[PDB]
């Protein structure tokens, strides 16, 4: 639990601080080496300061303060500083990220990230047959709700974890996808239980799959890890527009890769990290550009009834694009006029699903919030993140009662599924008198 | 010791005491009961005290010689005092003694000095009663309120491939 400062040239001890009550696992420092931050087993983060000029002249460090922000081991800590950014990020056995400001660590506010942010959904629900399917660590479990019964569970050989699972609308066909291979299994109900048979298709087995979706009970769309979109009937490749190379793309490759694949009534849309959205006609197998946004896309949805595509950027702005005005009149009126709740959200939206009773109404939810908006009504006009001075590259219902949320979707027109998440700790007594 | 330091409190070998301490101010076992009381045989009497049958208690003390009754009362106080958990059974003995030999006990020059242990002993149990009722009422309400208030479905890919 002791932190020691050593003179490099003479290889000798200069200062010793018995700060922590247990092992000190990791250390980090600011850009100017004015602050030394320690963290470790005792769940405490200690800041050591040499900022004062007299301290600098005398080369003496001072343990200014300490803070208790983690309920368990702080296995890792890192620091970043820039003209617009000041982040002290720590993580460990608590499974959550905690963010602080180096200059204002003692006095500044802090944010505790949710343990699970479902940017990629690990649970799906089938409206027909009322099945809820979750896949974790090469194990798939399926539940039926009339009240819930685990009808079946599937165990897979491959050490590789399951990337995605897609279930056919009928529910008879379940596709399990991994980067190494793709396997499809037919589900058949016998005696309130599902019988599993593995339909054999060589092409999928040798096919890498990031995203997979069902056109119908038979046909699927698969995007390979090399960004190859094709149709398999249970390969019909689909032409894709080329993306111009950018210095940001060179530095970070995956931004030009496909992030969200959504198919709806023979209409497919692809969103890349660079903000490029393209509408794909599966029958024609041709690509037409739709939009080019400046922010990362977090969620996409297609509404056939309104003949529009809903795109959500990282800044929680909502855009409704006409499929061929490029943007719907609602989007032109309401994108910058969103309610206070949407703008105030510090967690980005990740899931969109339609309302059966009214096609105009859409449902939106994040890790800790659920919202519904009607696109037929216009709204009344009336610190711990980058300031974003630089560019990224180069009728209304809101509820926060339910949290944390793994997956949200409807079972029926009037039935909503909300899926929620339900180790020893170093004893730091809280004095009570 | 530092002279600034204050001397601490130590009880040492002092004797504790209480203000109530007034010492310086067929099937019957009667014959055994009279026997042990006369001879102060703790072992013999303890066997007599082991009877839990009320009819035996009455019959035994019914025939006990009235003078021996007084010493019996004194001794029950002592045995109660050492072991309070035996309070329940031994009041019965003190009770039946009191009613049957009550006439004799009236014709005694002094009672409190010779029965001080009982009075002190009996007083202690009474001092408990007001508090226990309070405990019972609190203990009453809570219970009152609270009385009112995978392998079968498993599908293994390896075994399926095997057969």
């Amino acid at each position: 639990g002791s932190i020691k400062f050593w003179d490099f040239q003479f290889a000798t001890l200069n200062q010793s601080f018995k700060a922590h009550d247990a092992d000190v696992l990791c250390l980090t420092t600011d850009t100017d080496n004015n602050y030394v931050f320690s963290a470790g087993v005792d769940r405490k983060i200690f800041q050591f300061s040499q900022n004062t000029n007299k301290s600098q002249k005398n080369n003496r460090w001072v343990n200014s303060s300490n803070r208790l922000l983690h309920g368990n081991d702080i296995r890792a800590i890192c620091a970043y500083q820039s003209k617009g950014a000041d982040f002290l990020v720590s993580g460990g056995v608590e499974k959550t990220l905690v963010i602080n400001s180096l200059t204002s660590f003692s006095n500044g506010n802090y944010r505790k990230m949710p343990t699970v942010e479902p940017y990629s959904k690990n649970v799906l629900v089938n409206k027909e047959q009322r099945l809820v399917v979750s896949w974790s660590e090469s194990t798939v479990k399926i539940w039926t709700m009339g009240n819930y019964k685990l009808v079946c569970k599937l165990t897979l050989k491959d050490d590789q974890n399951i990337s995605t699972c897609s279930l056919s609308p009928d529910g008879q066909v379940l596709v399990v996808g991994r980067p190494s291979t793709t396997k499809v299994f037919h589900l058949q109900p016998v005696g309130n239980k599902l019988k599993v048979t593995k339909l054999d298709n060589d092409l999928l087995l040798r096919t890498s799959t990031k995203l997979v979706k069902f056109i119908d009970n038979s046909k699927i769309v698969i995007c390979s890890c090399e960004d190859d979109v094709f149709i398999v009937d249970l390969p019909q490749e689909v032409e894709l527009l080329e993306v111009t190379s950018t210095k940001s793309s060179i530095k970070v490759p995956y931004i030009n890769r496909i992030n969200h694949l959504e198919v709806d009534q023979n209409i497919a849309v692809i969103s890349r990290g660079c903000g490029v959205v393209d509408i794909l006609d599966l029958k024609a197998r041709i690509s037409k550009p739709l939009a080019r946004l400046n922010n990362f896309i977090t969620a996409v949805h297609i509404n056939t009834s309104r003949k529009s595509v809903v795109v959500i950027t990282a800044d929680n702005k909502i855009y409704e694009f006409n499929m061929n005005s490029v943007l719907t009149q609602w989007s032109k009126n309401n994108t910058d006029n969103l309610p206070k709740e949407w703008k105030t959200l510090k967690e980005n939206c990740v899931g969109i699903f339609s309302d059966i009773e009214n096609s105009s109404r859409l449902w939106f939810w994040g890790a800790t919030w659920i919202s519904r908006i009607d696109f037929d009504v216009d709204f009344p006009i009336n610190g711990l993140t980058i300031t974003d001075e630089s560019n990224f590259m180069n009728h209304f219902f809101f509820t926060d009662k339910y949290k944390p949320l793994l997956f949200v979707d409807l079972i029926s027109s009037n039935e909503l599924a909300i899926i929620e998440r339900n180790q020893k700790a170093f004893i730091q007594p809280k004095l009570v008198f | 010791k530092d002279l600034a330091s204050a001397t601490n409190y130590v009880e040492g070998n002092a004797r504790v005491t209480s203000g109530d301490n007034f010492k310086h101010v067929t099937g019957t076992v009667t014959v055994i009961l009279s026997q042990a009381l006369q001879s102060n045989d703790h072992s013999l009497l303890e066997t007599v005290l082991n009877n839990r049958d009320e009819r035996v208690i009455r019959d035994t003390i019914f025939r006990l010689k009235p003078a021996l009754a007084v010493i019996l009362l004194e001794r029950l106080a002592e045995r109660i005092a050492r072991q309070t958990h035996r309070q329940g059974p031994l009041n019965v003995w003190v009770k039946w003694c009191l009613i049957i030999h009550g006439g004799y006990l009236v014709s005694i020059p002094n009672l409190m000095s010779t029965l001080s242990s009982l009075h002190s002993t009996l007083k202690r149990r009474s001092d408990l009663l007001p508090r226990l009722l309070a405990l019972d009422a609190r203990l009453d309400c809570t219970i009152n309120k609270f009385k009112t208030l995978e392998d079968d479905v498993e599908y293994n890919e390896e075994l399926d491939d095997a057969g």
Binding site: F397, T399, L416, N422 | A134, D136, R138, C141
Partner: peptide, 29 residues
């Protein structure tokens, strides 16, 4: 009779001194 009246009174006096795995709920909109 006065015993039980008094004992009854005592109890009154001392008296006066003194998450599911699955839940079904209906949201409001």
């Amino acid at each position: 009779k006065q015993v039980e009246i008094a004992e009854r009174n005592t109890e009154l006096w001392n008296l006066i001194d003194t998450l599911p795995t699955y839940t079904m709920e209906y949201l409001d909109i």
